[PDB]
Structure formats: structure tokens, C-alpha cells
Amino acid sequence: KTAGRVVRITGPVVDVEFPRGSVPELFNALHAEITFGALAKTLTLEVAQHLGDSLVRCISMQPTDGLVRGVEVTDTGASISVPVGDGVKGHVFNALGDCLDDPGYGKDFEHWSIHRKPPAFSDLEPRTEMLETGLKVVDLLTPYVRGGKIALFGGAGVGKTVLIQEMINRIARNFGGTSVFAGVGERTREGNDLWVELADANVLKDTALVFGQMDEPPGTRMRVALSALTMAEFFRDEQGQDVLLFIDNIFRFTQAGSEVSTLLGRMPSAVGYQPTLADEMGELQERITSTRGRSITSMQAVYVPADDYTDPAPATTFAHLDATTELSRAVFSKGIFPAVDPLASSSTILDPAIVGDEHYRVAQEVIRILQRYKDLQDIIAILGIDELSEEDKQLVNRARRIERFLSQNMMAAEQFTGQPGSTVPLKETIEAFDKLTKGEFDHLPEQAFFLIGGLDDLAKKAESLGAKL
Amino acid sequence: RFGRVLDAEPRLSALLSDYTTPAEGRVALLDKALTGRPGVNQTAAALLSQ
């Protein structure tokens, strides 16, 4: 016939020999069969390289345990495809398009290949419409962009997932469009929690969930993002419906790529990463984008290994974003939630042209005060605050109050603390931080500013402490 | 012509293209399949077999 046979197996990577003239194209899906009892299954191999001599190196989506050399391998003749349409909403899928909450569902749907080129450059248009979230720190210092790309960077356990949940609550809840969530190499129980929460909040009927989680082979963990992005692309390009795309975690896509590259025999780059790290990341990211008249607001949680922000993965990820919230271990240690580093975070739309002159002025004054406090940390760690000048002492008190007031009781934090969250209008945020920067609340105790919403909450908490606003 | 027919049947060549098996066996396979036919030239047969 024309089927190949397995010749080499090195974990997830498989070498397959085909008859001449039947070598499958790159990224084609191939099917092999594992027949051993407990592990019996059908393997989907994605062609990754042509090795010559009619050999192809392929990445397996399922574990290859139990696979035998010489077993027949059949070429599907196309790449991995996933179901698309309004039918995907409300259902949970895996990287290959199989429905998990209801097996067999979506087999009759239109199927789109998970590999496609990004939009033509001529169709790209910069997006600068502010997306108001109701979080003080985000709205003030890192205003999110509607139809733009937002990222949440952070080491282990600084609050990336909780912030993703917060943004799902604040944005996807009262959203007229569709939402796509892509769990990429994260906790499976987190996927179950998200499923149940979306069902409870009635947002699930408008959301499509695709999960390739930690206990998956690197091939699945590097293709699940493509699958979810394909569903989002269908919603963007075929139904003209505003799309929300939450991804957690994209660094796991990079990590799976690194593992595959190691298995594929590629010569490692710096820090052991794949040589094609930036290229793979760009190929993925340029697909996540709004086009003229077609909006995708994407929000990606990016894991920072060992709290190292100079690691190649996040370092290359930084360039693909319109807004970048950076969660810091130190801020988290102080108890400030969300543990945003206001000096390392940024937004392309935080300029006087877009957000107005007063918003920009207040943000810049807050940043200046916090930068001066950061500079003075060296003195303060040794001698405390009392060796500073009167100007610097006043600035330090103001800065401590400001950094506490950037924290907020989040909606998604209720499950942890039992305290309901708060929403602060942008105008109130600007007014409040203008008052802070001018020293109108210097008399209030610091804890009065901790985990509250607007100025009314500030007054109530200050009164409960003992100071009157 | 032998080149053309081998090209048409890549799998036959692949089976014949292994030295992991005794030479006499593959020579016999070649004789039965292609070379051992009424019109095959004797010299071409011997050349291909060797």
C-alpha cells in the first residue's frame, strides 16, 4: 500500500519510514496503533522533519508507551484539525478536538486545520481603545487595550491564575461576544474548577474551553494553544464576533517546544532552549491579533521560571504584547494583591494622546514617587526612614500609602479571604491617586489603604482604624 | 525497463534493498518476481542478480 512503518521511538518523538513518493508533508497527521492492553490507543503523530531516505520525524500527541517498531503508520493526508462553529461554545475539548464533557460531540462540525498563516500585514491595524477593568492598578498604570494583547507575567504562585479569573469575571461576564479559554500545561484541577465556575456563572454557554494540561506529552502541550487559537480565529474571521481569548500558560507552550526540540535532536540554544524559540513564539503570537473590523482581546498568563525575568521565554514573549502586567515576588510578599510591580509593568496606550492629560499626569506622578521609593530602599534597608531628609521622608510615607492603595480586594479573591471584591471607576481612580500624590491622605494610617476599592472604602476603613477622612 | 519497474514498485526495491538477509534468498526473490521471465535478457538478468 502506501503506509509507513515506525523505525525509531525516542519518547514522544517517532521516526517513520514511508515508500518513496508517499512521504507525508510537514505537519500532516499520521495514525499509529498501540495494541498493548492497558495502553491500547491510536497515536496521532504530527510530521515535524524530513530526514531523507523517505524518513519523517514526528511528534506524538499521546504517550508512545507500548509502541512497537515496524507497526504500520497511516497518513491522514492533512494536518491536525479541530471542530469550529457555534457548536464548540459550552463544551470542553482537548488539543485534538475531541469533546471531553460529551465524547463524540462536534465530529460532524466543520473542521479547521490548526496550522495557518497569520493575517496579512495589510489587514493589521493598531488598537488603542482602552479596556476598563475596574482594578485601580491596571486601569491607572497599565491600561488594557480592547482588541489588543495583554500579558500577566509572574513566578510560581504570585497570582497569575487568580488574576486571569478576575479578568474573566470583570470582562467576559457581561461580554456580548465569544470567549475561548486555552489551558496550556496547567493544573487539571484548575481546569475542572474553571469549568464548574463558568457553569455556575452562566458564562459557559458563551465559552469554548480547550485543555492540554501538565500530564500531557510535550506535543499536545505545544499544539493545544494552536487548537484553541483556531477556534478563536474561526470566530474572528467567519462570524465577525468580538472574541476573548484567555491563555494559561503560554510559557508552558514554550517549555513543551523546548522538550520537543531536545527530542528532535536540534542543537540547544542558550539556557537549553530550542533554537527556534523566538520563531515558534512569533508564529503563535502573530495569529493572536485583531484585524481591521475584527477584534480579539487576548490575555495570556506567562510563567517566569525561578522568578528570572531575563529567561529567554518571557524575554521573547514581551515583544508581542500591547499591555504587560508584571507580578512581583516582593509585592506578593508584602501582601499586596494583585501583586503587580507598577514600575516594571507597561501599556502602549498609557500616553496623554489616548488616556487624556490628567490620567497620564497622575500615572506619571505615581510612577515617579514609587521610583524614588525604590531608589531609597537601599538606605532604608540599613538605617530605616529617619536618616532621610524631610522631603524624602514625606515622599516615602506617600509612596508606602500609594503602594498599599494600588492593592485591591479582587472579585476572585473572595474564595480565599471571604471578602467580596470591589470595582473602582477609572475617574474615581484618577481622582483618588491625584489626591494621594498631593498628600491629601497623609494623615490616614497606612493600613487604611490596604485591600479596598475607592475613596468611600478608604473613609470607612480609616474610620474603623481611628482616623477620619 | 528494470529500473522503471523497480521505480514503479518502491516496496519491492525496499524489500530487495536489504543485506540483513542471505544474498541467495534475495537473488531467488528477484528471479521469481522480475528477472525470471520469458523475455528477460540473460546478460541483464545475471548483471542485475549479482
Binding site: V68, R69 | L12, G25, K32, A33, L34, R37, G39
Partner: protein, 40 residues
């Protein structure tokens, strides 16, 4: 001049004419390499 079916009549006969024991070919530092065991 070529039947294209006698080809099968001969190749199936050849293939049909064909426990598993492997042999350590090299060993070092907790790793071993085995030749044979085609069905492993």
C-alpha cells in the same frame, strides 16, 4: 511483460519464509544497549 501480480506471488512467499532474545552490545553508567528484540 510484467504481470504485477507474480510480484506479490513471490514476495509474500519470501516474507512467509521468515522467544525473542537480545544481546547487550555495550554498557556503561547505568545504561545498556541491546541488539535484537524486534518486537519490544
Amino acid at each position: 511483460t510484467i504481470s504485477a501480480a507474480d510480484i506479490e506471488g513471490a514476495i509474500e512467499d519470501y516474507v512467509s519464509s521468515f522467544e525473542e532474545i537480545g544481546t547487550v552490545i555495550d554498557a556503561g553508567d547505568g545504561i545498556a544497549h541491546v541488539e535484537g528484540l524486534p518486537s519490544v
